[PDB]
Amino acid sequence: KEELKVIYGDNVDVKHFQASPRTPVQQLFDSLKNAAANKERAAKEAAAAASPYLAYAVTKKQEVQADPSNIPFDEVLYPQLSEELLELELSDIREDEIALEKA
Amino acid sequence: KKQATENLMKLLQAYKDIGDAKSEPLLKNHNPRTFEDRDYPVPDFRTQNLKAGDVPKFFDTVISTRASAAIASKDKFWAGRKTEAEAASAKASAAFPRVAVPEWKKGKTVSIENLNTVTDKYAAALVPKRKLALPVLPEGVKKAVEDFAASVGQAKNASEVSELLAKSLAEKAVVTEGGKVVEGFSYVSKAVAAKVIATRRAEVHERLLKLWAKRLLVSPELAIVPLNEFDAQLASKFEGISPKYQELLSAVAQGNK
Amino acid sequence: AKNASEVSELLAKSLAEKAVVTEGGKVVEGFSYVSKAVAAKVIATRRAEVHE
Amino acid sequence: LSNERYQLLSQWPDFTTMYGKDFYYRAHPEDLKKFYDAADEYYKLYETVTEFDSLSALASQVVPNYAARRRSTVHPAIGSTVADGAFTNFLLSKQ
């Protein structure tokens, strides 16, 4: 809910994204549909930052955070981990399917 | 503390090296299911003299013994892995990069051109070591294809003609490792893998629904013993089974007349 | 750049498929036409449902 | 003196190069909690050595005890080596 509160509002409907998470293309198009209010929030914050160290730091952080190529995809980063996190739920189901084949 | 942190960082390098020499899966040894013995002799409740309400408490202490013995077997793995990595931690390299702090001399000051290249080193580790090259359509090419549709006269649907060009590159977006494209890298996403789980849950839940369909077409009186109150009835002998539902099940089985 | 051929053709075809008609240089709007490959598919299915 | 302590927080190993999940899952669960505690400790040490607005009130804990030693009833600049050397003149002369 907190990860998607910054996009879809407060009535985020977390049931829809728990069941079917958003694809890497929909994570992109939710980045780009708030980027104009993100580049303007960073420019309004860098103008009112307390010192020109902090003003560069809130633009350099937003220059990295607004680029959608910098979103960390755990399946792209660690491919063997996200297949093994898949076979934690595929093995929990397989233990329920062996219990019905025995029955 | 700097030496403790260099010892810990050398230890976590020794853990990563002897776990990548053995080529083991990442989640395998942290999963205590993998240390569980499935070929254990599985104690039979019909030879342990249980009374009516005693069978589910027998089942809980056979499970929680066999689960505690899998956790304690995972602890014996990691306690033996620790001494294997602490031996190689003592023979290690210890050439780590240092934390980027702004350079401050003894009586001098700190330039903002050094506070900013330090902040560049913090925001250059915010990028991931391998990333999807998710393409934004620039306005330099999203207008050169919008007005090309507006010169033909599709200026009313000029919104959708750009988005398909954006999505067709977004869908076959390739991954890049160090700016270069690692090629032949297929990844399974988190919306694909949650569709494999949702169909596999639906094809095992319909076997549970088909299991109980046969048992309630043949024997429909079974729907009067609730599923949680079922093994609270059992005992070790058949004559010890709790008669809460026995005489009701015998009369519902005889039919509606 | 290896599949740079196909990424252009889909942009060509997406305008080609919803290509509008123009009468005198201006677009006559609300002009639906049934083509000669659509109308020969109406004939080929209607021939197959009377031959069966 | 804060600069001499900041110079040894400059030579601290970059622990954030081991935050990835290929170090998370290869490592013992107790040696990873120690590693995440040793990274939280550096931010405790570094955020207090760069608290340079606290040095001006630490200097006022040194001033009043020094300034009372200078309010000597003999001399502001008196010390033991001079006052022992002037006891040698006082004692090794006649009464």
B3, B7, B12, B31: which to substitute to probe chain D, counting the most D Cβ within 10 Å?
A: B12
Q: Count of CB atoms within 10 A of residue B31's CB?
A: 17
Method: cryo-EM
Do the Cβ atoms of B189 and B134 come closer than 8 Å? no
A9 in the Ramachandran plot: left (φ > 0), alpha (ψ -120 to 50) or beta?
left
Q: Are B153 and C22 a contacting pair at CB < 8 A?
A: yes
Q: How many C-beta atoms surround the C-beta of residue B190 within 10 A? A: 19
A29 touches chain D (CB under 8 A): no
d(CA D53, CA A17): 48
Overall residue count recorded for chain B in this entry = 257
DSSP one-letter string for B46-70: GGS---GGGHHHHHHHHHHHHHHHH
User: Using alpha carbons only, what angle is made at residue D33 by residues B189 and D35, rounded to the nearest 5 degrees?
Assistant: 95
Distance between CA atoms of residues B148 and D68, nearest Å: 87
C-alpha to C-alpha distances, D43 to A10, B31, B106, nearest whole angstrom:
33, 32, 22
Tokens encoding B60? 């809980």
Helices A35-47/A52-65 angle, 10° precision? 170
State the smallest CA–CA distance between residue D28 and chain B in angstroms.
6
Could B161 and C20 be called an inter-chain contact, meaning their C-beta atoms sit closer than 8 Å? no
Q: How far B172 CA sits from the closest chain C CA (Å)?
A: 10
User: Both tokens of residue B155?
Assistant: 């200026």
User: Cβ of D38 and B12 within 8 Å?
Assistant: no
Chain A CB contacts of D21 below 8 Å: 74, 77-78, 81
d(CA C48, CA C38): 16
| φ, ψ for residue A89, nearest 5 deg | -85, -25
Round to whole Å and give the CA distance between B129 and A55.
27
DSSP assigned state of B175: E
The neighbours of chain A, by the rule of 3 or more Cβ pairs under 8 Å, are B, D
Do the Cβ atoms of B172 and C25 come closer than 8 Å? no
Which residue from D60, D58, D59, D46 is spatially nearest to D9, judged by alpha carbons? Answer: D46
Chain C residue with CA closest to B183: the answer is C2
Q: Do A20 and B198 touch (CB under 8 A)?
A: yes
Q: What single letter denotes the amino acid at residue A10?
A: D
Chain D contact for A77 (CB, 8 A cutoff): yes
For chain B positions 224-253, those within 8 Å of chain A (CB to CB) are none
Which chains border C (3 or more CB–CB pairs < 8 Å)?
B
A82 contacts B193? CB cut-off 8 A: yes
Three-state DSSP class for residue B28: coil
Q: Is D22 on the interface with A (CB under 8 A)?
A: yes
Q: Which residues lie closer than 8 Å to B225 by C-beta, 6 or more apart?
A: B233, B245, B249
